[PDB]
Write a protein that binds this ligand. Sequence first.
Ligand SMILES: O=C1N=C(Nc2ccccc2)N=C1Cc1ccc2c(c1)OCO2
Length: 351
Amino acid sequence: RSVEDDKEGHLVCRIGDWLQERYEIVGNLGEGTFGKVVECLDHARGKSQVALKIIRNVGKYREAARLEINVLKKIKEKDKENKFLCVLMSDWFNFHGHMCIAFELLGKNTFEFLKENNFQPYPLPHVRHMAYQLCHALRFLHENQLTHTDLKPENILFVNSEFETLYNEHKSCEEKSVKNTSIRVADFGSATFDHEHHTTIVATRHYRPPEVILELGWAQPCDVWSIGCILFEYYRGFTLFQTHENREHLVMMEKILGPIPSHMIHRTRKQKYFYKGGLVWDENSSDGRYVKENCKPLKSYMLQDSLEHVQLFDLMRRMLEFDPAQRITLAEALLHPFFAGLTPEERSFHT
Ligand SMILES: O=C1N=C(Nc2ccccc2)N=C1Cc1ccc2c(c1)OCO2
């Protein structure tokens, strides 16, 4: 009957509340800028578990959620079998101006698992299987003229995030290892079809490619850049580009990956970042000092020198190509030698 929302537009709601007259809230799953996610029991479909994304009562976010519902439904029509690992939408509705999307309940997202593991990195076999799945899911989207644009660890969910705790003797610390590394891709609120208007700036800043910063236009290679940043973060446990400002971000890119190719510099209208073909920046700023203290060349972040590690870094570097026309495609990444080390079960998604 009566319903309340806060000045930020979120729905005020506690455990035990019902929505429509079928979803009963039984836990909190997290909250973004979009709204909240809550675990609900579906009293219309067997008292079964759904995750319920409750969107803020704000124009911008309602709109993004209508867009997301159109993507999700188009995806489930293109993939009736669920073979391409996108979260499965079971229902949607409008609850007093809050768009609500019901999803099949999954475990922790890959960021939260990492955070609860004190940011100890995923083991390489896990990184490999997660990479394979992301590549598979996104390659599917890509070939259906879709680009996600907001890939990041929080938008990647474990199907089941149950773990075992081992004791690591090198690190003199306990360590959690997820029992099943099957994942799903979430959050299509920013997903853009080839034929739709492309906003100048997309992606969360840390996962944002240089073509976006340099306003060179973007398309599917944007997601491949994001994936490379994500694999790094899974493998080291910290963010590759821990940045909050464009100039600083470009400096990190150069320091981690080498010079921005001169042809992208010629093409950009953001010439304020350059002078005589070189990036311009204040080395004495807190931003400058931070990047000089902390950003080193990609290869130096490698933890082990064995082949499987060498190959991950070859893959990552091909995903972090500056030029989006030369950046590896996901179709091509799926053929990369790094993936030879998957088990047959992993390769066939029987996990
Ligand atoms: O589309 C989304 N965007 C999400 N963002 C998010 C959700 C919780 C914390 C931080 C970010 N979550 C979903 C969907 C989702 C779908 C199934 C789930 C779930 C979340 O939590 C566990 O089950």
